[PDB]
Design a protein around this motif. Structure first.
Motif, short mmCIF file in Angstrom:
data_model
loop_
_atom_site.label_atom_id
_atom_site.label_comp_id
_atom_site.label_asym_id
_atom_site.label_seq_id
_atom_site.Cartn_x
_atom_site.Cartn_y
_atom_site.Cartn_z
N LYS A 44 57.76 11.37 17.26
CA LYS A 44 56.19 11.44 17.45
C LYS A 44 56.02 12.13 18.90
O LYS A 44 55.13 12.91 18.91
CB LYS A 44 55.72 10.04 17.23
CG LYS A 44 55.47 9.79 15.99
CD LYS A 44 55.20 8.22 15.60
CE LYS A 44 54.31 7.71 16.55
NZ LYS A 44 53.50 6.46 16.16
N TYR A 47 56.28 15.71 19.06
CA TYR A 47 55.33 16.58 18.34
C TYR A 47 54.03 16.61 19.33
O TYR A 47 53.46 17.68 19.42
CB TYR A 47 55.10 15.84 17.13
CG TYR A 47 55.79 16.52 15.88
CD1 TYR A 47 55.75 17.79 15.56
CD2 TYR A 47 56.85 15.76 15.30
CE1 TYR A 47 56.45 18.28 14.57
CE2 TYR A 47 57.48 16.09 14.08
CZ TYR A 47 57.49 17.43 13.86
OH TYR A 47 58.40 17.82 12.77
N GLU A 48 53.82 15.45 20.03
CA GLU A 48 52.66 15.45 20.80
C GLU A 48 53.06 16.63 21.99
O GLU A 48 52.14 17.18 22.37
CB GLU A 48 52.54 14.08 21.34
CG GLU A 48 51.33 13.75 22.01
CD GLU A 48 50.26 13.89 21.08
OE1 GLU A 48 49.69 13.34 20.26
OE2 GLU A 48 49.31 14.50 21.34
N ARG A 49 54.10 16.89 22.58
CA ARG A 49 54.46 17.33 23.64
C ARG A 49 54.51 18.93 23.33
O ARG A 49 54.03 19.75 24.06
CB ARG A 49 55.80 16.89 24.25
CG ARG A 49 56.26 17.62 25.41
CD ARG A 49 57.60 17.05 26.11
NE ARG A 49 58.13 17.72 27.10
CZ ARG A 49 57.75 17.44 28.66
NH1 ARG A 49 56.92 16.78 28.95
NH2 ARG A 49 58.47 18.32 29.37
N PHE A 50 55.37 19.21 22.30
CA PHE A 50 55.81 20.65 22.18
C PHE A 50 56.17 20.77 20.75
O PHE A 50 57.46 20.45 20.44
CB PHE A 50 56.53 21.18 23.07
CG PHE A 50 56.81 22.68 23.18
CD1 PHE A 50 55.85 23.56 22.76
CD2 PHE A 50 58.02 23.16 23.69
CE1 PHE A 50 56.11 24.99 22.86
CE2 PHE A 50 58.17 24.52 23.52
CZ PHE A 50 57.14 25.46 23.11
N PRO A 51 55.37 21.04 19.62
CA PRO A 51 55.97 20.89 18.27
C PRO A 51 56.64 21.81 17.59
O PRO A 51 56.93 21.67 16.46
CB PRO A 51 54.49 20.49 17.34
CG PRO A 51 53.46 21.29 18.16
CD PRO A 51 53.98 21.16 19.60
N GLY A 52 56.57 23.00 18.09
CA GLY A 52 57.86 23.93 17.67
C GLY A 52 57.91 25.05 18.49
O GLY A 52 57.40 25.23 19.51
N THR B 27 58.20 23.87 28.23
CA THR B 27 58.09 22.70 27.99
C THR B 27 57.00 21.97 27.07
O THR B 27 57.02 21.16 26.41
CB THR B 27 57.79 21.79 29.29
OG1 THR B 27 56.26 22.34 29.80
CG2 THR B 27 58.65 22.18 30.63
N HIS B 28 55.96 23.27 27.03
CA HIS B 28 54.89 22.72 26.31
C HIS B 28 53.83 24.14 26.08
O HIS B 28 54.32 25.09 26.75
CB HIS B 28 53.88 21.71 26.65
CG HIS B 28 52.91 22.01 27.83
ND1 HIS B 28 53.96 21.76 29.31
CD2 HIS B 28 52.10 21.99 28.30
CE1 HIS B 28 53.05 22.07 30.13
NE2 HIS B 28 51.90 22.26 29.73
N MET B 52 54.54 30.08 14.46
CA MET B 52 53.73 29.34 15.13
C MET B 52 52.31 29.62 14.96
O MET B 52 51.46 30.13 15.92
CB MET B 52 54.03 28.99 16.58
CG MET B 52 55.52 28.53 16.84
SD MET B 52 55.96 26.94 16.35
CE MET B 52 54.71 25.67 17.01
N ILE B 62 49.62 18.12 14.39
CA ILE B 62 50.45 17.27 15.39
C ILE B 62 50.07 15.74 14.73
O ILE B 62 51.24 15.26 14.46
CB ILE B 62 49.95 17.27 16.89
CG1 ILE B 62 50.69 18.50 17.68
CG2 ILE B 62 50.56 15.96 17.74
CD1 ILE B 62 50.06 18.77 18.96
N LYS B 66 53.13 13.40 13.09
CA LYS B 66 53.59 12.33 13.52
C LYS B 66 53.04 11.10 12.65
O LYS B 66 54.17 10.34 12.38
CB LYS B 66 52.31 11.81 14.97
CG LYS B 66 52.63 12.48 15.90
CD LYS B 66 51.32 12.65 17.12
CE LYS B 66 51.58 11.41 17.93
NZ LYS B 66 50.48 11.32 18.93
N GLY B 270 55.58 26.28 11.62
CA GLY B 270 56.42 26.19 12.75
C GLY B 270 56.87 24.87 12.90
O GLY B 270 57.54 24.33 13.97
#
Lengths: 424, 435
Positions: A44, A47-52, B27-28, B52, B62, B66, B270
């Motif tokens: 989880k 996914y919140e950080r960087f999901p793909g 990182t994001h 994506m 997201i 989750k 993605g």
């Protein structure tokens, strides 16, 4: 028929609340069971950080970076390089192609043939199914040419009349020598082996096998790949199957336990020698055309957590501690006249059914004895996989002593019932 | 190694870069941007790698992902009924496909699905009496070790890629060009023998080939030929599927009906590895009839997709189709094209090509002769690296650079993309000139 919405610990749980002790670990991958909170939280969080994302030469995620470093650390290698795929099938395909690429870049584009064994299981794609040694692939017109299958090192089944285990291994070494001499060493790209064959029926190699074949492979410059898709991350009582059988491969294929079953991903860990050869080859002043293999940042974050769980939260240790009890109980079950052998190691085992023990004669296929056992087990709240005339026990590493007893109690009831019925 | 860059460079294959690249550790992201460990932001005009399509921080997707983990399924190799997720995704896929009915088989990627469809044809033809019907017709070509990773499965037979600008003879119209390719296809079937051909696979717009839309009227000219023969038609929608060409499928955009569809990645935007094979009604029937006859069930085909993937795909499909992302492609495509037209007025741009939200620019040393820069000069690479220096990600392929940005891209972000790409092209072309 049975409606399943989730699991708890090592159990599949139906809609009515019946718990089924899952000795398949999902797809031979749920080492920490079905609802491990740490793994779920890690998924989880990522996914919140960087999901793909997708990994390129010179551009990748932090998770790809950290997992690559961890995997080299826990590999048998002092150094090396890692890439990722979506599955064990693609990791096997991609390692093959990397060898084809490397050998080509080194001036030997004929060095293409792939050595596996009969009863090997490497995947479902056209290449990995060709590496695989099962008769069911004939319906696809497989194997492709250049996928050579050596004798399966299963002494109980393949040893000739009065052939000792040492003699069998010497025979398999002759066969390898002679296959290499016949094919030509310059036309052979690599040898891949599961240390313990998984889907072929849980088959530990004959004693000494890897000790006898490794020198021959090395003599002829044939790269050695360990397919750790099933063995990897503790199932054989060491981190890797190749450790348990004391051989150092040139690379490792990993999947399944890699993410504790919580995400589909593969990994290929290149050892120092293949890594240096690929670096130097990449002389051609460019990146391999068409290489686009990538994992996933979520899969990488889950894998980091799976590794930590397995190695630092007791799960690999539980396998080492309970393996003796596991084998004891199997040894006792194998005293039955319809059990031909027990085989396995660590937390992967099989029992093979036979109509007559002395002659090793199976029940006729049309009686589905394996399946009968497997169905009766399910009736009794245990899940186990029928493979050929065998049933397989590959349970989660979180299995307690009590749950181990539960497993065997159910299984023994199933065996009594099924063997009584086929006797009638 | 202490630094992120040095960690990357020491333990990852992808970190081996030593027109040089330099190492970006990501990182994001946010909308269409990715952010690295040092805080540099880059507009990601490749959508990761095509997939994506909703960007990097889409909250609905997201939350859905989750939620799947919060309640992980009892996902099993063989025990228990197909999950409600998977059944519902299969219904959805059949619905959104061009087919009125069919069957769905699942994999972990577009690549595996492709491979699975090949195997399916081998199985089915062999079951029907023709185990020699194995060749796949394809437009694939290389740009020795250079054709390992792309090389199709043994038995592929190559057709000419319908790239008019590249392959058109001097003074040949686009129409005549399509008529010549139709002759090729006829000749190739006669030479190989229809009875040795398993199928025809085509990406409607060729993706890894350099973003190449087919010559006007191509599909209209080749389909009738393939239908004279029982050569199954497979639409490879791993890139074109779910909106990138301005329609739900590439095969809708080029107005043809395949026998099956290969789908990938972009199924889940993605978020989760998945592929699917969607068989139309004829191949479903034949497949069924083969299984109940030689009687095996083909190993490794599965109608049970990963349940987490399946729930995520359902959400992704609904986002793209019903929360405006596919429409945004259609709405912003004209402006995409207009800017590329302008860019192609440059002497070192041989052409722009593409459709919807997939485009390429091809660099040339001499435009009138279509002469490319020397391969050693690695001009695409240089352009891409310069884009990176300027906060833009684009992908070098051959002598081209490719843009396939997320579907959420706004007009302002599109301007930003082109602004940075134009400054990259200015700098590379001048430095090339100067040397």
């Amino acid at each position: 028929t049975v409606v399943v919405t989730h699991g708890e610990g090592p159990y599949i749980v139906d809609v009515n609340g019946r718990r089924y002790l899952d000795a398949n670990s999902g797809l031979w991958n749920m080492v920490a069971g079905f609802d491990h909170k740490g793994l779920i939280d890690a998924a989880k969080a990522q996914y919140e950080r960087f999901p793909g994302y997708h990994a390129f030469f010179g551009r990748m995620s932090d998770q790809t970076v950290m997992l690559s470093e961890k995997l080299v650390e826990v590999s048998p290698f002092d150094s090396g390089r890692v890439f990722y795929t979506n599955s064990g099938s693609e990791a096997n395909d991609t390692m093959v192609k990397m060898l084809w690429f490397l050998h080509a870049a080194e001036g030997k584009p004929q060095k293409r043939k792939i050595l596996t064994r009969w009863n090997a299981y490497h995947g479902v794609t056209a290449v990995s199914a060709s590496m695989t040694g099962k008769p069911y692939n004939s319906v696809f017109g497989l194997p492709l040419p250049g996928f050579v299958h050596l004798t399966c090192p299963h002494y109980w089944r393949y040893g000739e009349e009065g052939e000792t285990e040492e003699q069998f291994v010497a025979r398999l070494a002759r066969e390898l020598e002679e296959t290499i001499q016949r094919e030509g060493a310059d036309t052979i790209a690599g040898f891949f082996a599961e240390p313990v064959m998984g889907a072929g029926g849980v088959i530990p190699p004959a004693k000494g096998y890897f000790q006898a074949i490794l020198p021959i492979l090395r003599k002829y410059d044939i790269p050695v790949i360990s397919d750790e898709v099933i063995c990897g991350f503790g199932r054989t009582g060491n981190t890797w199957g190749c450790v348990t059988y004391d051989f150092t491969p040139d690379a490792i294929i990993s999947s399944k336990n890699l993410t504790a079953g919580f995400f589909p991903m593969g990994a290929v860990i290149l050892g120092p020698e293949l890594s240096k050869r690929l670096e130097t080859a990449i002389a051609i002043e460019e990146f391999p055309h068409g290489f686009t293999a990538s994992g996933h940042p979520v899969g990488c974050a889950i894998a980091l957590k799976a590794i930590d769980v397995v190695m630092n939260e007791g799960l690999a240790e539980n396998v080492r501690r309970l393996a003796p009890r596991f084998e004891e109980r199997l040894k006792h079950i194998a005293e039955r006249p319809n059990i031909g052998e027990y085989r396995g190691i660590g937390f992967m085992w099989a029992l093979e059914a036979v109509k007559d023990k002395a002659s090793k004669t199976p029940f006729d296929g049309n009686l589905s004895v394996s399946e009968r056992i497997a169905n009766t087990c399910t009736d009794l709240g245990l899940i186990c996989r029928p493979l050929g005339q065998s049933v397989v026990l590959c349970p989660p590493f979180i299995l307690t002593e009590a749950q181990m007893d539960e497993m065997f109690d159910k299984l023994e009831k199933a065996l009594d019932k099924v063997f009584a019925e086929v006797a009638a």
